[PDB]
Amino acid sequence: GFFALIPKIISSPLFKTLLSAVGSALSSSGGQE
């Protein structure tokens, strides 16, 4: 689930706090996708 791994990424761990930080930088380059 490369498209649904986002919600599962935090499902296990508890880094959701930084998720909003890493998720914005990892998705800030969608133009190259």
Residues 6+ apart with CB under 8 A from 23: 6
Separation between Cα atoms, residue 6 and residue 23, nearest integer Å: 9
Tell me the two tokens of residue 16: 């959701």
Separation between Cα atoms, residue 31 and residue 25, nearest integer Å: 12
Tell me the two tokens of residue 8: 């599962």
Separation between Cα atoms, residue 28 and residue 25, nearest integer Å: 5
| CA max distance for the chain | 29
Whether the CA torsion 1, 12, 21, 7 is positive or negative: it is positive
Separation between Cα atoms, residue 18 and residue 13, nearest integer Å: 11
25 alpha carbon, distance to own chain's centre = 9
What value does the CA radius of gyration of the chain take, rounded to a whole number of Å?
Answer: 10
String of DSSP letters for 17-33 = HHHHHHHHHHSTTGGG-
